[PDB]
Design a binder for this molecule. Sequence first.
Ligand SMILES: CNC(=O)c1cc(Br)cc([N+](=O)[O-])c1N[C@@H]1CCCC[C@@H]1NC(=O)c1cncc2ccccc12
Ligand SMILES: CNC(=O)c1cc(Br)cc([N+](=O)[O-])c1N[C@@H]1CCCC[C@@H]1NC(=O)c1cncc2ccccc12
Lengths: 306, 306
Amino acid sequence: SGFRKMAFPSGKVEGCMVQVTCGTTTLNGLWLDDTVYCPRHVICTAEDMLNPNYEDLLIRKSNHSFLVQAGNVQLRVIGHSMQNCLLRLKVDTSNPKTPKYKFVRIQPGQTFSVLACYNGSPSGVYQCAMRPNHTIKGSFLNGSCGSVGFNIDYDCVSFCYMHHMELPTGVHAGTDLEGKFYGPFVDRQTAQAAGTDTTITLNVLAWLYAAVINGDRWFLNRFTTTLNDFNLVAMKYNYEPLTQDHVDILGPLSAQTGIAVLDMCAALKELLQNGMNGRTILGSTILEDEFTPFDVVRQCSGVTFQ
Amino acid sequence: SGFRKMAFPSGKVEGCMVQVTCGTTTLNGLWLDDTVYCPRHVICTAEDMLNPNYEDLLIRKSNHSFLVQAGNVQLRVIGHSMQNCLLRLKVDTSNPKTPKYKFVRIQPGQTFSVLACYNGSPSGVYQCAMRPNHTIKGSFLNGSCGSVGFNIDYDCVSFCYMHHMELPTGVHAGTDLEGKFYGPFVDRQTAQAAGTDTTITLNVLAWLYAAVINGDRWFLNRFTTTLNDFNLVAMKYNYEPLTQDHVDILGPLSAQTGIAVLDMCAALKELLQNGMNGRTILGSTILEDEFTPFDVVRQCSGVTFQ
Ligand SMILES: CNC(=O)c1cc(Br)cc([N+](=O)[O-])c1N[C@@H]1CCCC[C@@H]1NC(=O)c1cncc2ccccc12
Ligand SMILES: CNC(=O)c1cc(Br)cc([N+](=O)[O-])c1N[C@@H]1CCCC[C@@H]1NC(=O)c1cncc2ccccc12
């Protein structure tokens, strides 16, 4: 029993974190095979950042403008290229600890583990959800750029996030491992801000199924609802609209609990309209939306506490 | 910015998890140097558990009654002993991935990272606090016994918890790495239950200091309080009594924010009496008590957002 925000074991990623220095700036890089990936703003000064032209800044650098430190060892750069908002540094040594890996672009609402690193040294690990406004509510200080987000399936690491910046409201933005930003953000110092956010409806429903799997049914009711009638309530409370694709995704959790998806939507509607009456669900006084259906199946028992 | 329940990177511990089999039971073990540690109830059957005599059960086993699997490799047991509620198995191979480590017994209210493992394979990582009633609110299924809790200081792993059981309310109990249980629990199937719990006052205060460090002061007031007047309110709301030792511990966080400890206690008293008025603190609608002062200093900036 129990239900926690649970990250993937981070060991496979720890053996890939390095330090990258360009001039006076140091940040983290990701060392896979003979390549080190890091944010391209490592080549910028404080003044460059206000209006950088990265093509023009990078042509002025050589291979020996970059220092890569893997633990105690210096790695020699033998090539460099830019891929969107990432710098790719070729190094003289293949990482012996390179795991089986993939680069994936995750979708809003999906979750991943974050390995916070400073000066190439892993510092902490926690679980994050990609918000609908393409930010994450991470925990990051200066020096955290280059930190990565990942999922692990069996022995294969799926890297999906590299950290680049913190926005004025304190939330965080970055790229996939092809250097394409999540969201409309850019790596320059401008007045950009995160857009308005919304609650991840699919995740709230998955989490309510987790509560039933783990033995709690107090929030259910005798009612059902249509997609359209639920989405009218969802609009009022700033929830994402429920789609038929989301209904189909909840199929297995609906089958394990015997609660039809639209019946659980009637439960959620009632929770939104009446509140929770000073009760808790899986220890929470609010509706959690940072667990996907996959996270619930990963963590919960396959047998419901009936 | 940001503030998350953050675990230590788990890689150093992952390289120490093995599988231990005795008869039909399989659970996790901790492999350090030439020794594997695991719960002694691995030698019990379902019937033994109702009333086991572990001295009598263990004398009936040989070295080859135990199978240890480290990844793909079988480790040969060459010795076995019991230390309190743990089995110690000597094996023919020293773990090459053994980190610098220590065994510590943590105190109630302190936190640690948990590496959940099944069949000797790490599954997930999350952060837990030792409750005052000597349980932890973990996330564990059958097969999780032998999973360990740890902290990491620099490159030294301080193991403090090994998982043994889940209690009727769904919370978890276990031992230190000398096999002594936290709390009054025993490794046999009886009617034992977790005692009544209480809120960790020192941690709530540390977390309020984190909120101020990160830029939020809405919950402060112009009042101060004495230790005794606070503890009268603490008794009413099921908070641990505040001691002078706890006041001394908060010294550095008080210095960084310029908020005297007894002034922050006046703030907390007002929060307990008036509620939070539909506001949040560091994203939470409730008062968090699973962050120690050490956790706050570890994660927060050393400069306050004034
Ligand atoms: C704070 N401000 C921005 O982060 C920022 C804002 C904008 Br608008 C654009 C960029 N940009 O184009 O890179 C930004 N990144 C900074 C500029 C140069 C590259 C790295 C810089 N950021 C960090 O070091 C950083 C990351 N995470 C959490 C932090 C917490 C405290 C202090 C710093 C950080
Ligand atoms: C459930 N019941 C107890 O866990 C239990 C209760 C008491 Br009272 C005493 C013991 N005791 O003396 O060991 C217990 N451990 C069981 C007995 C043999 C040793 C391992 C057993 N437990 C687990 O496998 C287990 C651990 N964590 C979370 C779980 C979630 C679901 C199912 C199982 C677990």
